[PDB]
Design a protein around this ligand. Structure first.
Ligand SMILES: *C(=C)C1=C(C)[C@@H](Cc2[nH]c(/C=C3N=C(/C=C4\NC(=O)[C@H](C)[C@H]4CC)C(C)=C\3CCC(=O)O)c(CCC(=O)O)c2C)NC1=O
Ligand SMILES: *[C@H](C)[C@H]1/C(=C/C2=NC(=C\c3[nH]c(C[C@H]4NC(=O)C(C=C)=C4C)c(C)c3CCC(=O)O)/C(CCC(=O)O)=C2C)NC(=O)[C@@H]1C
Ligand SMILES: *[C@H](C)[C@H]1/C(=C/C2=NC(=C\c3[nH]c(C[C@H]4NC(=O)C(C=C)=C4C)c(C)c3CCC(=O)O)/C(CCC(=O)O)=C2C)NC(=O)[C@@H]1C
Ligand SMILES: *[C@H](C)[C@H]1/C(=C/C2=NC(=C\c3[nH]c(C[C@H]4NC(=O)C(C=C)=C4C)c(C)c3CCC(=O)O)/C(CCC(=O)O)=C2C)NC(=O)[C@@H]1C
Ligand SMILES: CCC1=C(C)/C(=C/C2=NC(=C\c3[nH]c(/C=C4\NC(=O)[C@H](C)[C@H]4CC)c(C)c3CCC(=O)O)/C(CCC(=O)O)=C2C)NC1=O
Ligand SMILES: CCC1=C(C)/C(=C/C2=NC(=C\c3[nH]c(/C=C4\NC(=O)[C@H](C)[C@H]4CC)c(C)c3CCC(=O)O)/C(CCC(=O)O)=C2C)NC1=O
Ligand SMILES: CCC1=C(C)/C(=C/C2=NC(=C\c3[nH]c(/C=C4\NC(=O)[C@H](C)[C@H]4CC)c(C)c3CCC(=O)O)/C(CCC(=O)O)=C2C)NC1=O
Ligand SMILES: CCC1=C(C)/C(=C/C2=NC(=C\c3[nH]c(/C=C4\NC(=O)[C@H](C)[C@H]4CC)c(C)c3CCC(=O)O)/C(CCC(=O)O)=C2C)NC1=O
Ligand SMILES: CCC1=C(C)/C(=C/C2=NC(=C\c3[nH]c(/C=C4\NC(=O)[C@H](C)[C@H]4CC)c(C)c3CCC(=O)O)/C(CCC(=O)O)=C2C)NC1=O
Lengths: 160, 103, 161, 206, 92, 177, 160, 161, 160, 161
């Protein structure tokens, strides 16, 4: 989370948190419930969104769905929606703890070697998350989707 | 249960203790004659403690560190929508490491 | 090294669940006390040297550990104390902000009681110093904030015991 | 092929890894003094008396000690008609004062294993402060009036633990008197009459 | 010289590890610990064993013990193999 | 012996004067009658050299088959072991009299004694005679009604300590029966 | 400032700035209007904040101004107030920078070496800044006094 | 760190005698299989990533170690596996060439099972991964070469157990 | 002492002791008769060396004993002289050890942390030891006063 | 690491008292032998290689630890001995000057017998070597100086046992 980054970043200098950092905790905690209210909106639309993600990741990339591709077959596609479910679940964690570590300690750190040992094309997974961010805009209004927009494209930046 | 309304507050008076003091009268007495008691109960009516008091430690979480990660053992609420099952299951593990899930 | 939000996420995350309404009660509960913890950590940063000076004068510079032969006699040994007490008042401040004592046993408690036994540092006088340091910390930050900062002091005293 | 083979690798090696298990510097596995005794299940009064008396902090320390912890049959053997005179008074709850020295006479600075006492008689003072003579002759070791039962127990900080059959009382230890009555002289004229006058000291009077 | 010259907060050399070690200290511990790197997955360096048991001096045990937990290590056991306890003079 | 009353630790560097986290409430409460108990154990262990020799010779002169050859106390190793075991039993009642509870006696002295005495052929009907003499000997000494020896105690009462120590001796005597 | 060390933090980590870092640069610049008002209050109150600052300092520490004190006479007392004008100036920098980074590398790094080498009691100058803090927070509302006082006590912490 | 020739020379040297007929008899036996080991180590170097991808997908790719909570959950933890399995397939290749498993316990086995217990890594799933990795290695190098490379895999599995 | 650090010097260098090291252990032990006489003079002059030591200390630093000074009242002034009895004792150790090694690890290592943490002016206690030095060297001849004073000024140097 | 003067000062300091007549009484006893110890340490420095050459040739030169299979066979292993015996003759020289065997267990004895058991070094042959080395050291420095230097050799042999 954000307080953890301040306690850590202040701990390697052997000092208490300064004036600016205590702002960064205080301002983060005052915007508390709005992340809490937002994640309940997204949890009610996880079956909403991943159905829309499978819309365009496969019409864009029929290579993976076709016989021979990695996602060919039922059970391969079955977990395919599961990876969207874990990613969307991770983003609800990142939207709450207002930073990137739950998207980075999980999911991002070492993701390429995971997929490369699986056969999933790592470029295709970048479009999958970009597809997932494209899908979240429809079930979300303009007020709060740019609140969740910077959490998506960090994942794309992490995967390249 | 307190079922002794047969025994009031005159239970253990022990009326027949009798001391003759020679050939004269029997000198009857009702001395109560308590036991070698001790009344074995814990957490009595007061505290009886000056502070000298920091005794509290958490329970051992195995190999990780205490309370750091009892995360496998938690009440929790929701699962997700797709969630493919496990199909090999390899034992329930126990503790996760000097480690956490947020690496 | 987890805060209250990290621990809530994790228990959401080790089992793989989403963030359900009952789990958020502590969080909607942690954000409510977010204003109290910063002001508590504010004054403790200001009066760090004053709090440690008050604790040692109130607990142990009054018993023959301070005199020759006691565990705190030489100036190197005395200077190690206020260096040592600074960590307890500092790391307890971190636990008060993070709302989770995971940082204490991660960075303070492990190998601590096993280290004092090596040096021969009296664990009895150490806890009473922290108890006295907990008593002065409730003076500054108030009652409930002292209840919060005090909740991590005895966590150190419990594990260090 | 020689029996006492060795450790190492590469050429000039006997087929045994370094350190017999590939570890040059082995992490220890022993516990400290007081909970090596707590696991033994025989030093129960010893570890309890240490915890109550505050001596247990002293033998927590990392200095190489040679504890002569008596098994509780030794403590159970404190009901001598003789030894009960000089030791029963410690059962009173105010006499923790002598209980620390009497327990501190069982700690010896240094690591004296029984193999290090091959027909050797060496003395030393305790952490109580008074000398004790450890004597090892004819495969039987002694520590004052100990008559050690179990040879050695390896402990955490290179410390040793020997099981003794009795409790060693320090040499110049006098038993604390029982709690008494502060008595005061009833009269004052029975004491002026008890003091010899100067005229008495010169033989001028009877 | 020693690490306690008068340095504390607000002093010219940066606020850092201050050990209570005397002049040319001769006390050293025997420590045991695991210390996972937590940085190999974006650096991709070769791997080294993280479970070590070694003799660290008293002059720099505190810095090392303060650092082993910095990177998530766990200390399984430490002892004071060489040196005395409560010793005023003689640690040199 | 010395765990039977808890003491207080007043000096520093102890870990029990400060981070004791308790005071032992079950054993402070036993110095509330502690001098009367300590006179009672002193009444036993100043006569424990004579109580064991009188009681073992008491069951010899009532059942004389033990010192007959073929009996279980004829040879010198068996006669020395029989005088040792009554001395050990009289010590362990004197722990349990001192500590005020029988929990020391039942595991260190009585746990696995009936299986031992049938594994060695020890007559169990005669050994319970040997502790009933010591049951009758100890209540004479604690109440100061011994015929040949008195001791100068204070002025008071010591019943409900004599019946406390008589409740330990049959607790021995049924654990080997 | 918060802008420069949120950069050099993400600079060292070989990465860009997270939402946690960019939603606070954003949150700080919208805070910039309110910061200049706060620093504008202390800017032309230095006549009272310093002179009343040295007011309570001498009433609480008459030794430093008494004969033998470091700030004794017409000369040293003028310099005795000069340093308070310095530290009051650096607090105006920290309020506008949103951090004690200006106060860090000016008047705090190695401050004990200077004042120990000048013969000045460093505890005495710490008492002076505390007296200025009560005058400063008495000039502002409660929402502001949690900031202007907030930078003084950091200077109090580093000055001992 | 001894090969078959180093171990033969050591035992013949440790008695101070020359290389008699029995010592050279084993050395000739090692030189006969010298052609087999290089081709075995040849194909294993080529299909290093393919073998590890086959083992994890065949042993622990789908069972619960991978699902949240188990372990390989996080991407750092998953990436540590194929890094970790690479050493077993690599050091086993060294033992197959050297003809002596001394390098394994020298550089792999010592402090290994004591390390996984610290991290909490499941030794049960680890051995089955190596067993599955041993099964695919017999596919590439053939039967007898798989018997050779397989002879050092279970040596790792035995000591790691 | 000179014996222990001439050893640990040659200990670290993997060598024995040179003639330069062994002709000084030799030269020091023949000096040992004269050292005990010097320490014997300061041993039973602590009544005058301390009490006259605090004599000039208060006349030169009346602030520390005045109301508000650290050693104010009957209580602190007793402890005010207690520390001088400490440092006078350590100088007797340094004279017999032929080095400030006893004074180094007792009363010198980390001394600024203690006195700063006690609120005591460390410069004030340095003035106290200098006042003791003039009393001590006034009790001995010129050949001795070059030693007994020699250990005080080392304590003066490390105490600031 | 304390000499006779350091140990005397420590015990007199640990009770917080001055150096009374008994503490200085031992210190005068140490200064009397100060002339003897330097000349003892003088000749030992000169004949360091000669003493070790005499001890090994007199105790364990031709025994079957020297032959193949024995614990001292290879040249690396033989060279480790005279390196190893040099420390015993060197650190014993330090104890002879300091007049206190604290340096031995501080820097030699701790982890020593636990190390030889790891390597498999015979403690039995080690102690005679030191006993034979003690015998030649009494040749050079004389009788009483040999009594002093010999007093620390068996201290090593006792603890190493
Ligand atoms: C042989 C057939 C035979 C005996 C031998 C003798 C043994 C015996 N004694 C008792 C009763 C007591 N024994 C006591 C012991 C002692 N009295 C002393 O003064 C000394 C110190 C000590 C002996 C060395 C005591 C105090 C009693 C109680 C009676 C009293 O007040 O003296 C018994 C048991 C009798 C019973 O249980 O009623 C026996 C068997 N008696 C023999 O008949
Ligand atoms: C039966 C249980 C006994 C028994 C009883 C007899 N007692 C006889 C006479 C007697 N008894 C007492 C004691 C008793 N009487 C009292 O007045 C008092 C109290 C003051 C007591 C305790 C006395 C004093 C006497 C008189 C003796 C005398 O004459 O000197 C007795 C004789 C017949 C009778 O008098 O009733 C009997 C049968 N005697 C036994 O043999 C059994 C065991
Ligand atoms: C009981 C079987 C006796 C008896 C006992 C009483 N003793 C009383 C007081 C007392 N007893 C002792 C000795 C005891 N206390 C110790 O600390 C030690 C060991 C060192 C021993 C052996 C002392 C010292 C005292 C106090 C002396 C005094 O104040 O007079 C006592 C009265 C106090 C109480 O009851 O708590 C009693 C009744 N007296 C008897 O008559 C029976 C035979
Ligand atoms: C004498 C009153 C008895 C009798 C005694 C014998 N006991 C023999 C051996 C024996 N006794 C015990 C129990 C004792 N040892 C303990 O450690 C404790 C409690 C802590 C007690 C009560 C044990 C365990 C043993 C066996 C080991 C040993 O020799 O100590 C014994 C020897 C048997 C033989 O050699 O044939 C005898 C004669 N036997 C009797 O007939 C009278 C009634
Ligand atoms: C929390 C972070 C996290 C992730 C993401 C994760 C992924 C993951 N994806 C896998 C497989 C797979 N994943 C895919 C994925 C895809 N095919 C497509 O066309 C798509 C673009 C994509 C899905 C959106 C396929 C086809 C396989 C099966 C490959 C095979 O085994 O043949 C496997 C092997 C076992 C399994 O399916 O559970 C893992 C562990 N583990 C993690 O811990
Ligand atoms: C951040 C978690 C953490 C802690 C707590 C810690 C403690 C620690 N305390 C130490 C010493 C010490 N600690 C004390 C403390 C005390 N003496 C007393 O009488 C009091 C009871 C107590 C003060 C409260 C003393 C006197 C020493 C010096 C011991 C010596 O020189 O032998 C040392 C030895 C090295 C050094 O100080 O440089 C360490 C490593 N290290 C850590 O990483
Ligand atoms: C921006 C950060 C900063 C600071 C703080 C600073 C301080 C500073 N203080 C000085 C002097 C001085 N400072 C004092 C101060 C005091 N006397 C007392 O009694 C009080 C406790 C205390 C003031 C509250 C005195 C008396 C002098 C003159 C000392 C002398 O003449 O020897 C001097 C030397 C003369 C000068 O150039 O002004 C400097 C450089 N410089 C800086 O750049
Ligand atoms: C060359 C000999 C050698 C080995 C073998 C070795 C292992 C080793 N494995 C590690 C971790 C690990 N190892 C695994 C492995 C697994 N998880 C599973 O479920 C499977 C059963 C298994 C894969 C087969 C994981 C997940 C970690 C990360 C643990 C963590 O982050 O807590 C670590 C911690 C540091 C790091 O990876 O950077 C070491 C040192 N080191 C060595 O020097
Ligand atoms: C052997 C090396 C050594 C030293 C030096 C030492 C000092 C020392 N000085 C103390 C107090 C003190 N020291 C002073 C000293 C002074 N006040 C003044 O005005 C003067 C400038 C100065 C004396 C010349 C005062 C006033 C106290 C009490 C402070 C208080 O009560 O808050 C205390 C706390 C009380 C005690 O245990 O005595 C210690 C431990 N300990 C050591 O082991």
């Amino acid at each position: 989370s954000l307080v953890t980054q301040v306690i850590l970043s202040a701990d390697d200098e052997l000092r208490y948190p300064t004036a600016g950092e205590l702002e960064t905790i205080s301002s983060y905690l005052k915007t508390g419930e709005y992340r809490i209210r937002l994640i309940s909106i997204l949890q009610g639309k996880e079956q909403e969104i991943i159905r829309l993600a499978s819309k365009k990741i496969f019409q864009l990339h029929p290579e993976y769905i076709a016989p021979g591709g990695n996602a060919s077959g039922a059970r391969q596609r079955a977990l395919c929606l599961r990876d969207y479910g874990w990613y969307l679940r991770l983003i609800t964690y990142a939207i709450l703890a207002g930073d990137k570590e739950p998207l980075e300690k999980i999911g991002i750190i070492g993701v390429r070697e995971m997929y490369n040992s699986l056969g999933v094309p790592i470029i295709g997974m970048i479009d999958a998350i970009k597809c997932l961010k494209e899908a979240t805009v429809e079930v979300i209004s303009q007020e709060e989707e740019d609140f969740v927009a910077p959490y998506y494209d960090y994942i794309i930046q992490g995967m390249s | 249960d307190v079922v002794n309304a047969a025994y009031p507050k005159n239970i253990k008076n022990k009326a027949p203790v009798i001391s003759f003091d020679g050939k004269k009268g029997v000198k009857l007495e009702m001395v109560t004659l308590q036991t070698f008691a001790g009344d074995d109960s814990e957490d009595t009516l007061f505290d009886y403690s000056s502070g000298k008091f920091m005794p509290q430690k958490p329970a051992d979480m195995g190999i990780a560190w205490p309370s750091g990660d009892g995360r496998q053992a938690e009440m929790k609420g929701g699962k997700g929508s797709f969630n493919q099952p496990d199909l090999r299951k390899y034992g329930p593990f126990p503790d996760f490491l000097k480690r956490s899930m947020d690496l | 090294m987890q805060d209250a939000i990290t621990s809530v996420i994790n228990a959401a995350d080790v089992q793989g669940k989403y963030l359900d309404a009952n789990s958020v009660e502590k969080l909607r509960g942690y954000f409510q006390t977010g204003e109290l913890r910063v002001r508590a950590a504010a004054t403790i940063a200001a009066n760090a040297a004053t709090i440690i000076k008050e604790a040692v004068a109130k607990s142990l510079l009054y018993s023959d550990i301070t005199r020759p032969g006691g565990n705190m006699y030489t100036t190197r040994r005395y200077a190690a104390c206020i260096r040592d007490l600074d960590y307890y008042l500092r790391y307890a401040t971190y636990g008060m902000l993070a709302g989770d004592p995971s940082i204490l046993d991660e960075r303070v408690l492990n190998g601590l009681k096993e280290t004092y036994n090596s040096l021969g540092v009296p664990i009895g006088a150490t806890i009473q110093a922290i108890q006295a340091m907990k008593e002065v910390t409730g003076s500054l930050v108030g009652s409930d904030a002292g209840k919060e900062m005090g909740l991590y002091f005895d966590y150190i005293c419990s594990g260090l015991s | 092929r020689t029996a006492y083979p060795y450790t190492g690798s590469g050429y000039g090696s006997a087929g045994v890894p370094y350190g017999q298990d590939t570890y040059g510097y082995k992490a220890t596995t022993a516990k400290s003094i007081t909970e090596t005794a707590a696991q033994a299940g025989v030093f129960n009064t010893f570890v309890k008396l240490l915890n109550e008396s505050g001596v247990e902090k002293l033998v927590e320390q990392a200095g190489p000690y040679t504890v002569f912890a008596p098994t509780d049959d030794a403590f159970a053997a404190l009901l001598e008609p003789h030894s009960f005179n000089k030791l029963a008074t410690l059962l009173r709850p105010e006499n923790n004062d002598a209980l620390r020295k009497v327990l501190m006479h069982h700690v010896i600075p240094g690591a004296f294993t029984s193999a290090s006492l091959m027909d050797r008689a060496v003395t030393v003072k305790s952490l109580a402060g008074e000398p004790i003579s450890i004597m090892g002759l004819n495969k039987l070791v002694t520590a004052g009036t100990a008559k050690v039962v179990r040879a050695d127990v390896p402990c955490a900080n290179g410390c040793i633990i020997h099981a003794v059959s009795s409790v060693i009382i320090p040499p110049n230890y006098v038993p604390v008197p029982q709690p008494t009555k502060p008595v005061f002289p009833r009269s004052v004229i029975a004491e002026i009459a008890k003091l010899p006058t100067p005229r008495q000291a010169l033989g001028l009077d009877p | 010289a020693y690490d306690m010259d008068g340095t504390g907060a607000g002093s010219l050399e940066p606020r850092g590890i201050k050990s209570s070690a005397v002049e040319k200290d001769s006390r050293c511990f025997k420590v045991t610990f695991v210390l996972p790197s937590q940085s190999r997955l974006y650096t991709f360096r070769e791997l080294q064993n993280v479970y070590t048991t070694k003799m660290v001096p008293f002059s720099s045990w505190y810095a090392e013990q303060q650092r082993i937990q910095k990177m998530g290590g766990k200390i399984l056991k430490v002892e004071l193999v060489a040196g005395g306890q409560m010793r005023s003079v003689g640690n040199q | 012996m010395l765990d039977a009353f808890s003491r207080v630790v007043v000096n520093s560097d102890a870990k029990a004067a400060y981070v004791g986290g308790s005071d032992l409430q079950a054993l402070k409460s036993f110095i509330a009658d502690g001098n009367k108990r300590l006179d009672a154990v002193n009444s036993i262990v100043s006569n424990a050299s004579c109580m064991v020799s009188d009681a073992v010779s008491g069951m010899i002169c009532e059942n004389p088959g033990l010192i007959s050859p073929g009996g279980n106390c004829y040879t010198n190793r068996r006669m020395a072991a029989c005088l040792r075991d009554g001395e050990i039993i009289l010590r362990y009642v004197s722990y349990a009299l001192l500590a005020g509870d029988a929990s020391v006696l039942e595991d260190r002295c009585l746990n696995g004694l009936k299986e031992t005495y049938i594994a060695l052929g020890v007559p169990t009907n005669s050994s319970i005679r040997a502790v009933s003499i010591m049951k009758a000997q100890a209540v004479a000494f604690i109440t100061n009604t011994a015929t040949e020896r008195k001791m100068s105690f204070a002025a008071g009462d010591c019943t409900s300590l004599a019946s406390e120590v008589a409740s330990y001796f049959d607790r021995v005597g049924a654990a080997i029966s | 400032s918060i802008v420069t060390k949120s950069i050099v933090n993400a600079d060292a980590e070989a990465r860009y700035l997270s939402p946690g870092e960019l939603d606070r640069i954003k949150s700080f610049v919208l805070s910039g209007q309110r910061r200049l008002r706060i620093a504008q209050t202390l800017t032309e109150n230095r006549e009272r904040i310093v002179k009343q600052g040295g007011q309570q300092l001498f009433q609480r520490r008459p030794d430093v101004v008494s004969p033998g004190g470091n700030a004794y006479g017409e000369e040293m007392t003028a310099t005795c107030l000069r340093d308070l004008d310095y530290y009051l100036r650096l607090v105006t920098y920290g309020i506008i920078a949103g951090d004690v980074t200006p106060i860090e590398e000016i008047g705090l790094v190695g401050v004990k070496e200077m004042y120990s080498a000048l013969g000045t009691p460093i505890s005495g100058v710490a008492e002076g800044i505390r007296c200025m803090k009560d005058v400063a927070c008495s000039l502002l509302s409660g929402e502001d006094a949690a900031e202007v006082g907030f930078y003084f006590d950091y200077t109090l912490a580093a000055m001992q």
